[PDB]
Amino acid sequence: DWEQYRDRVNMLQQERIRDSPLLQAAKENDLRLLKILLLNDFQQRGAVGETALHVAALYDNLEAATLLMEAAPELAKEPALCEPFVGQTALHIAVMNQNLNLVRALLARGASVSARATGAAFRRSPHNLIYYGEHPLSFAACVGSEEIVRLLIEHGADIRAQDSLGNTVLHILILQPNKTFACQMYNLLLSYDEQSLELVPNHQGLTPFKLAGVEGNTVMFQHLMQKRKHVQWTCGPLTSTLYDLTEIDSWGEELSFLELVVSSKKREARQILEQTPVKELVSFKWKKYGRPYFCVLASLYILYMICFTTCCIYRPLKLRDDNRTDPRDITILQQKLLQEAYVTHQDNIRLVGELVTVTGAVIILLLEIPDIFRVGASRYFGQTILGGPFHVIIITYASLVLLTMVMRLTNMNGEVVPLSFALVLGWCSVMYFARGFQMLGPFTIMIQKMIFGDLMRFCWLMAVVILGFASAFHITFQTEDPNNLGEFSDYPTALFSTFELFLTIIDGPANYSVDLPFMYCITYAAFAIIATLLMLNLFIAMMGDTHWRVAQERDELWRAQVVATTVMLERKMPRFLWPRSGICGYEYGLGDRWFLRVENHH
Amino acid sequence: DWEQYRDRVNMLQQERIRDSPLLQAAKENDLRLLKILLLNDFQQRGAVGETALHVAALYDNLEAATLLMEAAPELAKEPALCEPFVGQTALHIAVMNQNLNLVRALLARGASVSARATGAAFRRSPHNLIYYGEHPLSFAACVGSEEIVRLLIEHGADIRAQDSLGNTVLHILILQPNKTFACQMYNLLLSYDEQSLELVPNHQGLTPFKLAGVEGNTVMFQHLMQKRKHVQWTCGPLTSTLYDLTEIDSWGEELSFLELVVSSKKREARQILEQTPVKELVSFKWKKYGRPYFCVLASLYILYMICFTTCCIYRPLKLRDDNRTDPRDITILQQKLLQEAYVTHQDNIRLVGELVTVTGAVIILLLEIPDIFRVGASRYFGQTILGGPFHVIIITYASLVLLTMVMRLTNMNGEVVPLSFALVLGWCSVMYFARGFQMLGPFTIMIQKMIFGDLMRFCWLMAVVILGFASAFHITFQTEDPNNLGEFSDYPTALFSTFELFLTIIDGPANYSVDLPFMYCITYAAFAIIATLLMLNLFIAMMGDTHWRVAQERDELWRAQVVATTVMLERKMPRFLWPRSGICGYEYGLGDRWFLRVENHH
Ligand SMILES: CC(C)[C@@H](C)/C=C/[C@@H](C)[C@H]1CC[C@H]2C3=CC=C4C[C@@H](O)CC[C@]4(C)[C@H]3CC[C@]12C
Ligand SMILES: CC(C)[C@@H](C)/C=C/[C@@H](C)[C@H]1CC[C@H]2C3=CC=C4C[C@@H](O)CC[C@]4(C)[C@H]3CC[C@]12C
Ligand SMILES: CC(C)[C@@H](C)/C=C/[C@@H](C)[C@H]1CC[C@H]2C3=CC=C4C[C@@H](O)CC[C@]4(C)[C@H]3CC[C@]12C
Ligand SMILES: CC(C)[C@@H](C)/C=C/[C@@H](C)[C@H]1CC[C@H]2C3=CC=C4C[C@@H](O)CC[C@]4(C)[C@H]3CC[C@]12C
Which residues point to the Cytoplasmic side (chains A, B)? Predict the structure, then answer.
């Protein structure tokens, strides 16, 4: 694995230092021995192709480093050579150690300011505890050294330089934990840009501004907004400000800033939506267009489900041609064949409802399937914010409807099976529209967080308890007459009865007109204590204990689902229903830009 | 008892001081009277064989002590003589009182630095509020007096000296509450050791390092780690450190450090497992070997339970030879005798499943019973962390399986009884494997903490309520026809029905075709209010109120169960499946030691 390999690389590096007297002296800073060694091989390389001057820079030994450079000035220009450290120079190491005097001493000897630390230790990865890109300037900026950054710019470090992810030093600063020092560095780097470095995309296609949204860097986002706002006036406690919408509203682009924020896997990304500019734009969009249109789509989908339900109530059945020869058989009706299912005016009225049902199932797939491809299936079905579990069940519903149509056209028996699933999944998918309402939306997120959390854990241990007790009840009743107590008469019935008895949805079996086996009363007393008194009430207790913890995240997720709905509706609906948001600058001599005006009290 | 004896010892001591003018003067420090007394018996002894110089040292009376020593220098060498205080000298007392000048005055007169306070007041026990071992140096160290410790070392106090538990001053310092001052003292004492005192075991077989793990002394453990770590390099925000695994991983030893920590009765011991070295070693062991092998053992045990369950479903039964002459008798099948139970190919297929069932029951006892002997039964079955309640039920399961085999071989009727218990206990023991999963493990600890806590308290008061109401319902129905209401027709049925009615698992008995006794409606209304409205819902309330309090400990116990599982699997499984953990130093010129490399951000 990567851990045992990186560990071995570090062990070999330390051994090759111990085993080589020049590298050992470069580590210890014992100038005595280092003078004797250098007085009479300077190109000695440690385990990763690093020089004695890399070793001196790592241990921050300026005296050993200057003594090595006086003996062999060429060492300042040397990269390391083996996979984790490829392209790392002594300048990269000195910059990480913030040794300004060693950085001056290396630059005075022509250490390259444009050298790339290409190796696996510098790539953005869960394997690496930091990501500073590949260039000495990016290292100096992430390390927070203003003076080393100026010094590197004065030696001609290219501020536009991009690493193997396409990230510029501005993208790399958005990715750092030290957000306030990163904002101070971001102004310093923007000062040397006199087309802008803020507009350069990485290989994901993201500008620094879009990356601050995706990564949920609210401190860098509100900093980037200071160059995109204009204060129109202040009057006593009131200010009117005008915010440039260009990089937020993302007009005509296939993948907007707001879509990149609501579809981001970073939990912090949803905090960008609470910023004054994003929140007030998405609140306006939801008030004026999103809620009205989402209420119309909720209404149309409910009418479509009432239509489909009515087609199931009026489903074509006839008297069974076969005989109920078995006394346990209760089936009296049967499916009509296709050639006898469409005869009456009522069958033609149902054919219109069935054609509406099939048309809406086709429309669901035409609306759903392209968004799987845009978003990618694991992000599309996985994200709560986008509607993930509802997309699974609405596609499953449309698939079961089209399967049922194939069964109807082919005289296939058993339409009850896909129709019963489609009635449950079709109606449960009406809970998708709960996101439009503050009353229902946060509660629908609790339902989901309880299904994937507490209900999952419970059903795993509940199933183990049901297997034990169903088997004990079944073998307890194997010797007894099934007509006097039916609940455990075969093993599938014993499982189902034990499941219903666990949940207390069927009464505990009793028949006071006969002697039940004594082992039933013993087993059922233990079951009643374990399943109903303890586990069924402990479920309520652990749900109550989850509920108060999850409640703050439930509300943050609901507010983000409203924005994701707004972004989805504006993307998918006809543009004549969604007029461009904010204020057109061309009406006021401000150019082609669009704005949001926010007036606030302070 | 010990309390009334120690109290009497203290009362007699104070009386013998009051009754003896020299000891009374040694307590008061009235040098006037003490001069008159000493001018013309110095060997006067208080209630515990203590001298007037012990009394002067106890009351911290340096002037009386020096005046007593000037009259009788031999008193500095005297021990106390009666059971609680045997071997205590005036030096032990002066050291506890931190009187450096009295310690100098006693050492100047040859008070023994190697004297042992052998008496019952100095032994590690719940009877004693402190434990400083038996020697003046251990007293000075636990009292925290650096200057008295140096002074005693300068007078030749043996730093290797061991008390009646085999504890050295280092072991005794791990046992003190003042952990940060104890670490400062631990460095001072290690400085005089120039085979090491850190390697000396006590009579439990524990070194100071193992004792810090067992006692959960995380402050002393992280201090002891500072002499067992090497910083390989630091580069900007990153450091790589190498930790010596020798005393943690405990190779080839019959009882490891990690086993001593997970099996400790101290609740603080589980905090040692969260230290960087222990946590990262046990996390690696669990990731690479523990979880994969525990998932295989979970799978094999579930397949074994499905096999046993199938042998119970296909259990050999025939039509009853006897007649159902009683109209209340519902038994229609009976056990086959052994000589008719193995005839068909299906019986031979079941014999293979029954031989697998018996083989796994023998294997369970071969795996379980030796670990009872290693750990000791009360620690083995008592500890949640080790699997205690699951070890009880898995041994009970294997015992019921082997009992059932003896019943099968002997034509003994009633195999339903041990098989019904074995099906419940065998399946409920699958919850042992819940510890391997973050989803199920903490919840399985809540199940256990609720069974032993809230369910226990509830079942005690619930039983008292059922006894009252079952008796009232039984005598209410004694005069009435059992065929019209069967629930209370005899006292065992009335108990069982009242138990099912308490839990609301059977419907309240009613028969609108007859007049029930009016006393039933009155009694059942009171029962319905007390049992179902109040107590059954108050159970949910007290569980909810336990759940939020226990939730932090539940997670700490789960994280410790994962480590205990890892330690158990590595101990019990073949060593070719468990390669030695960490980094072999011999590959890198570091010797025979093994290491963990931890790289961290700061
Ligand atoms: C035998 C059939 C009828 C079985 C398989 C049916 C199961 C359905 C009812 C289950 C499967 C997944 C469940 C489910 C998935 C996720 C969510 C999202 C949550 O925010 C609201 C509830 C909701 C919508 C629930 C409702 C009930 C569903 C849809
Ligand atoms: C406890 C958790 C794990 C939940 C999810 C599981 C419930 C189990 C016990 C349920 C789920 C569906 C149930 C089920 C489905 C349908 C039938 C067909 C019927 O003719 C006999 C019973 C039988 C075979 C029952 C047995 C019990 C089952 C398998
Ligand atoms: C009449 C028989 C069937 C009676 C005696 C059976 C009782 C069983 C089901 C009881 C006895 C002890 C109970 C028990 C003991 C302790 C634990 C550990 C806990 O972390 C998970 C639940 C678990 C495993 C439960 C499950 C149910 C058990 C095993
Ligand atoms: C309320 C708590 C204390 C729980 C643990 C106790 C429940 C009691 C009421 C249960 C446990 C087992 C039950 C029980 C076992 C088996 C039988 C044999 C049956 O032919 C008559 C009823 C009888 C005798 C009932 C009576 C009620 C008992 C004794």
Answer: 1-292, 374-384, 435-457
Whole-angstrom distance, CA of residue A55 vs CA of residue A64: 9
Contact partners, residue B489, CB within 8 Å, separation at least 6: A512, B477, B482
* Cβ neighbours for A219, distance < 8 A, ≥ 6 positions apart: A179, A180, A182, A183
Ligand 3: does its nearest atom lie under 6 Å from the Cβ of A356?
Answer: no
Cα–Cα distances (Å) from A165 to A10, A200, B260, in that order, read 26, 12, 49
Q: Is the CB of B539 under 6 A from ligand 4?
A: no
What tokens does A460 get?
A: 């795993």
Check: CB of residue B426 under 8 Å from CB of residue B397: yes
CB pair distance less than 8 Å for A545 and B544: yes
What the block records as the tokens of A235 is 């009057």
DSSP bridge pairs for A239: A234, A600
Nearest CB partner across the interface for B317, out of A97, A468, A478: A478
Instruction: Check chain A for breaks (C–N over 2.5 Å) and list the residue before each, or none.
Output: 40, 194
**If you write DSSP's letter for every residue of B196-230 in order, what string do you get?**
-GGG---TTS--HHHHHHHTT-HHHHHHHGGGSEE
Domain range enclosing B14: 3-244
Residue pair B92/B136 in contact by the 8 Å Cβ criterion? yes
Q: Give me the torsion for CA of A491, A492, A496, A499, rounded to 10°.
A: 60
* Cited resolution, angstroms: 2.6
- Collapsing DSSP states into helix, strand and coil, what is residue B140? helix
Structure tokens at A372: 């799987």
Alpha helices, H only, A376-514: 377-382, 388-409, 416-428, 441-450, 456-477, 491-502
Cβ-based contacts of A19 with chain B (< 8 Å): 589
Taking alpha carbons only, the member of A420, A444, A446 closest to residue A433 is A444
CATH number for position B156: 1.25.40.20
Question: Which residues share a beta bridge with B584?
Answer: B594
Q: Are A96 and B235 in contact (CB under 8 A)?
A: yes
Could you give the 3-state DSSP secondary structure of residue A227? helix
> CA of A52, closest CA in chain B: separation in Å?
15
**CA-CA-CA-CA torsion sign (B61, B67, B71, B73):** positive
Structure tokens at B381: 């079955």
Judged on CB neighbours under 10 Å (0-12, 13-18, 19+), A50 is: buried
Specify the pairing of strand A317-319 against strand A594-601.
Answer: unpaired
Q: How far apart are CA B189 and CA B129, in angstroms?
A: 24
DSSP, residue by residue, B8-26: HHHHHHHHHHHT-HHHHHH
As a whole number of angstroms, the distance between CA B397 and CA B435 comes to 20
Alpha carbons within 13 A on the beta-carbon side of B530: 15
Residues 35-64 of A with CB under 8 A from B: 58-59
- Using DSSP, state whether B490 is helix, strand or coil: coil
Which residue type does A252 have?
A: G
Instruction: Indicate the SS3 state at residue B524.
Output: helix
